[PDB]
Amino acid sequence: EVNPAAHLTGANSSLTGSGGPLLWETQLGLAFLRGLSYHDGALVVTKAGYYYIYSKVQLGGVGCPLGLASTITHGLYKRTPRYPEELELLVSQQSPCGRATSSSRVWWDSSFLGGVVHLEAGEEVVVRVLDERLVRLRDGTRSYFGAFMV
Amino acid sequence: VNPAAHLTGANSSLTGSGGPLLWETQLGLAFLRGLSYHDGALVVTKAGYYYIYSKVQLGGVGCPLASTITHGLYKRTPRYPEELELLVSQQSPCGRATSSSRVWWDSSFLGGVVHLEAGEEVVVRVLDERLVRLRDGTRSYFGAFMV
Amino acid sequence: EVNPAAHLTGANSSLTGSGGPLLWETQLGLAFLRGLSYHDGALVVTKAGYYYIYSKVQLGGVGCPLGLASTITHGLYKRTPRYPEELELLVSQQSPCGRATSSSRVWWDSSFLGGVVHLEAGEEVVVRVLDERLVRLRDGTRSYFGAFMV
Amino acid sequence: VNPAAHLTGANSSLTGSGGPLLWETQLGLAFLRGLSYHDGALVVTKAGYYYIYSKVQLGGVGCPLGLASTITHGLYKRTPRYPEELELLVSQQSPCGRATSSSRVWWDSSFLGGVVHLEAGEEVVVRVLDERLVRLRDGTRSYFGAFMV
Amino acid sequence: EVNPAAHLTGANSSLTGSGGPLLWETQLGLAFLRGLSYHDGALVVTKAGYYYIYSKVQLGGVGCSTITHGLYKRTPRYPEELELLVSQQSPCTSSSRVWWDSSFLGGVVHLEAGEEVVVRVLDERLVRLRDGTRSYFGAFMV
Amino acid sequence: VNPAAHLTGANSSLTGSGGPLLWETQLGLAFLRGLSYHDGALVVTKAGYYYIYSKVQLGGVGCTITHGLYKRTPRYPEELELLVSQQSPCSSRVWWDSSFLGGVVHLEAGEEVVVRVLDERLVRLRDGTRSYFGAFMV
Amino acid sequence: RSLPSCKEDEYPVGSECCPKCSPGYRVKEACGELTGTVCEPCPPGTYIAHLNGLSKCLQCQMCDPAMGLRASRNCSRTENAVCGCSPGHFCIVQDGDHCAACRAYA
Amino acid sequence: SCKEDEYPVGSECCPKCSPGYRVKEACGELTGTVCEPCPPGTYIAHLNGLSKCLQCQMCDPAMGLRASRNCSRTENAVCGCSPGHFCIVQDGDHCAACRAYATS
Amino acid sequence: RSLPSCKEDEYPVGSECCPKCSPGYRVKEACGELTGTVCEPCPPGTYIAHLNGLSKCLQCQMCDPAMGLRASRNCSRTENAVCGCSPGHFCIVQDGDHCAACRAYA
Amino acid sequence: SLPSCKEDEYPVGSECCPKCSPGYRVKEACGELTGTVCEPCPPGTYIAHLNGLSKCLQCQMCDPAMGLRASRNCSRTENAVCGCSPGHFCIVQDGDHCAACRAYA
Amino acid sequence: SLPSCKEDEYPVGSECCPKCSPGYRVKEACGELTGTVCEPCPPGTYIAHLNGLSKCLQCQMCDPAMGLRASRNCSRTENAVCGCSPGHFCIVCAACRA
Amino acid sequence: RSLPSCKEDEYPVGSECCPKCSPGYRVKEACGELTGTVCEPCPPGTYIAHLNGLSKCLQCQMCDPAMGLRASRNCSRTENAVCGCSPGHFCIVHCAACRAY
């Protein structure tokens, strides 16, 4: 009785800039799927139940697009045929430049979330960050998206 | 059936009274499966090891008392007359802000595995409680599952 | 029958300064091992599989340490006899203080990561923080390292 | 013919890659006499003892951010006899810090020399830990050489 | 026609604290002697002639006057050491702040058979030994 | 015979005239062997590659030094920089610092090398052991 | 040349299709081969704005007075609250549709 | 139902261990609470039914702190300022951080 | 005190050692009693830099133009990519012995 | 590149001879019939990999006057590593490791 | 002690040889031929005067990290000259703060 | 068992021993079988303070006015200059440097 689990890793394709969700690697390096699928950025549930889902995104930059006004949103969202809108699950807000000055412009910060949610067969979870320009991809170890059934 | 719970930040969520944060247990994302709830606490029914977690969303329109925030998970047990700290974080966002009057946001996450006996309780505390920014249950929450 | 789990806590000897991993307490207080073991800072896997691994480190300071790098990592690493270097698994990059930080106030910042990884028997996981001078040890509740099979 | 060389600072010297400094080998003051060059390294043809040397000019306006407390300038051997570089001759400096007035120019030159044994096919390179400190000009201020003794 | 040459490296016995010269390693690691000898800190000349001699010492410490770093000749022709090549440097601060500074000297000097060259540093406690690559002493005939 | 020389700072070493440093060629540790000297310059006789070096002892009672080796040749009407260092020397404290350089250069018969220091006032002459200038063929 | 699917007002249930529930209502029991979808109203504090097949309603957002905010529109079973500025406050950051934080006028 | 000096273990109400002592073995209907002293570095300050002692806090020298009261089996350590340091952030009875006096 | 181990050129499979694959390749199948270790080369965008018993190659790092960087050496089977300044940029942030961000000339 | 020896060998003249184990240096190079003759690194030195070195690497010292002591001693196959002396805490960092410690006040 | 050559020639062994124009180096020294052959300086080098040099002089690089750019580029007859980048002012030109 | 050696006032030449020269003089020519050590005075700017077998004299030290120093004792063929403070000047750091009030 295999327990569903997955870990997907930041990829060179990861940031579409389309306003769609982030995409993720599923097969290479540290990424894998066990009893879950993937579709267009989404972990797709096969087996219904309660899943701990989690994501980390590594942020950083040389200054911010908006100065001390800049705000980041990092979230996990459910897509389901039962509703025609995406539903927020777990969301964080950060003020990434809040401590920066003009002579201290370069910054790095990670955002992590996790939580247990109920998912039916055929439902999907995706990760979204606004603004994607602050995501600093490296090699799949700094940004990632996963789940396992509990 | 493996116990699990996810509790969401609530209208009530802040009593203000030196008591812990309060949470919603049934509406929306919130649920209890084989754990119970009482006055802010997840209450354990089946003894074992649990991964407990909490996220709280902090923020403010600028910065007015204490610059240091504590966000913690704590155990209440008839085995000891004080709450025991389990997993605790400290944060300083206002202390180091370049502008005192800017809107700011910061999210505090923790989790870990702790051992819990039947009848033992876990609560979440934040000081100062007024830095917690409630919305719709997606940004501040409290959960657990047995591992 | 017994699902492997562990939780290891910061302790007086956690910060060796040797370029090696953090060490941890494994028995007293909140620390325990159940079906995992410990060796020089590592959780040692005995039963192969997929594990959620996590670590928290409490950072902070009075002012900012001299000569601190611009970027600091907090990460989980795999040691395996399949490779003579450690493999990065899950890493956060942060800039917690610098030049512009006031010499005179206390700052605090906590770093959490988690994720699922595949581990064979005899493989190990360790935690590293690039500059240990930022780690603020207390009583085992602010810095820690754990895992459980999923 | 006694092996000798002097390589000089050039616009490609500072790669920022974590590799060694690169050098000009033919133009101006640079030359190779019975030694070769490859990716920053002086490559030995005739086995023996060589005095090796390097100067790097450091300086700046202010101090680069996040500068380490200990900066090294050194000469290192690469050999097929070992899978890592071996340190030969190294200096530690603390050229500037967060206190350094960001309103003025500082300069400091680092020189080292010594005799080492090199076999045929072994290589010597120069590294500086933090290339942002290095102030290239025209080949007169930073350089790398050797001659057999 | 074998040209005398030597390179001697910092060692754990290098700093005697006795008012005498620094001592050095002569065989292990990167150290060697070729047509020169060694005795109590000194390179001892067998073949008379002009030598380029050199020393590097790595100095440093955490917080903290003048440092002196020198090469000196001992000769039966004079009851005292002759200063050959010498440098003075200022040390050093936060007393939480490390400083480092390397001192290099080189030059050509005439040496007869049986004459000796040694290295001295004052104050010896500011020398930061590591692994033989930071502080060293050598020569070759030119 | 392999050419070589070591020249020592001396009472006349700093002219204060905008010309190069001068040096002692015969007394104490100074000597010339197959090289000559002329108004501060080491003068080459036998052409080829030389390791040239100079040390200058700098210092002061309270308060950009350039220290350089230079080529004079009838092949060009200006001095040519060979090897040059910059140092930030320096309120009210005593300080010392030594500048050393060396390197291999090609010199033709008749060509000259000199040493300059700006500002010359910062050179602390003592007895020829602390500021010197030398070369040898390699 | 498309593929067949649930209608807009239906949702999947196995390989079948069941009718969606109305706004302000959630599914209590799925439809069966005789039986219709059984719907129940969203309890207070929650909403669902559209036809749905959700088992649970959506939590209403609170408008944070500490953020200089107040409800332009209270929550109802069919609609989320909307937040705008309190009296004596101006919006300092929009979040697209709505306002996120307001400051006083001194 | 347990009185003050007892605590619940399964179906039973068991006697508590004294301060400085931990429950090595819970009471059964037939065998008593077995109390053992906390090992070094840990403490329990009250009558208790804990299987594990509380870990004592470490006073961090890099924060300008030392132990003004050592950890014992019944009492957590308390922190105050190191010599040549003064308090800049205060908690309850102790400091959370001290800075050093400047000198000339 | 250590346990007995395989040679610097071998790696554990169960209770025995097998030979390690060369840099640039990963293990496709382990020794049997009478099968050599079958290695397979690293796929694009991955690398392994040493002799290894790894079942999966290491992911190559990306050099971010938004940080002023480009690859000064491209990922290869045996070597990770390495980053340098983009043209018209100079290094302004260091990470250990290498550049982490570059700034465009004004 | 050029033609090279296998990982467990190193070049001797125009040929290749087997490398010595970690902890050992080359005492005598291989001939056609005769293997590489190796010998253990003396105390104070190390070699951490298969190697063709004639001389061991010198171990680093940990300077008590910088508030340090060896947390791991030099051995034949491994360099010493430095950590704080008792009653000292790290105040200076060199990359991932401590370069100096300060005594408690 | 006299120069080997009159002002407009330079010594090459026993002989006195004609010089080469700015921007050109001596490719083939006088010897069997009474005359000199001159060839252009390669890119990145210069020679600014009448000369008997076998190698051209390396042009200086203007350091952006010091707030400098070339106000005059390097050419075969002239070295680069450095001045401030846009928005900077000379502090020493050898360095430029904004 | 002690070993043979030049006398105090002699110095080694080859396998043999020659007499040293007086302070203020250097060896111009080594002693021979029939001939004495030939010595010659040290030129101005140099000294030698003891009997010696040196081919060169030691260079006298200069006293740097710029460091607030004057010669208290001038250099001579047999002793080195010694420096102290100039008038209107007192020692900070023999004094290596002095201040004007």
Ligand SMILES: *[C@@H]1O[C@H](CO)[C@@H](O)[C@H](O)[C@H]1NC(C)=O
């Ligand atoms: C929401 O409810 C409260 C009290 O029940 C009322 O006073 C308020 O005006 C309502 N707000 C709006 C915008 O309808």
Ligand SMILES: *[C@@H]1O[C@H](CO)[C@@H](O)[C@H](O)[C@H]1NC(C)=O
């Ligand atoms: C705490 O215990 C230590 C350990 O021996 C002792 O040296 C120290 O003085 C004690 N401090 C106090 C305040 O009792």
Ligand SMILES: *[C@@H]1O[C@H](CO)[C@@H](O)[C@H](O)[C@H]1NC(C)=O
């Ligand atoms: C690396 O790859 C690209 C093609 O993808 C090529 O244009 C570029 O020049 C290569 N870079 C290097 C440094 O070889």
Ligand SMILES: *[C@@H]1O[C@H](CO)[C@@H](O)[C@H](O)[C@H]1NC(C)=O
């Ligand atoms: C390293 O060596 C010393 C000297 O023998 C020894 O006493 C000490 O125990 C060693 N250190 C460690 C941590 O093993």
Ligand SMILES: *[C@@H]1O[C@H](CO)[C@@H](O)[C@H](O)[C@H]1NC(C)=O
């Ligand atoms: C030393 O000699 C100088 C120069 O001739 C002379 O003027 C001075 O008076 C003398 N001073 C002493 C102290 O001998």
Ligand SMILES: [Cl-]
């Ligand atoms: Cl990544």
Ligand SMILES: [Cl-]
């Ligand atoms: Cl919320």
Ligand SMILES: [Cl-]
């Ligand atoms: Cl802790």
Ligand SMILES: [Cl-]
């Ligand atoms: Cl240069």
Ligand SMILES: [Cl-]
């Ligand atoms: Cl050393």
Ligand SMILES: [Cl-]
């Ligand atoms: Cl001098």
Ligand SMILES: [Cl-]
């Ligand atoms: Cl609901």
Ligand SMILES: [Cl-]
């Ligand atoms: Cl307990």
Ligand SMILES: [Cl-]
């Ligand atoms: Cl315990």
Ligand SMILES: [Cl-]
């Ligand atoms: Cl693997």
Ligand SMILES: [Cl-]
């Ligand atoms: Cl070797």
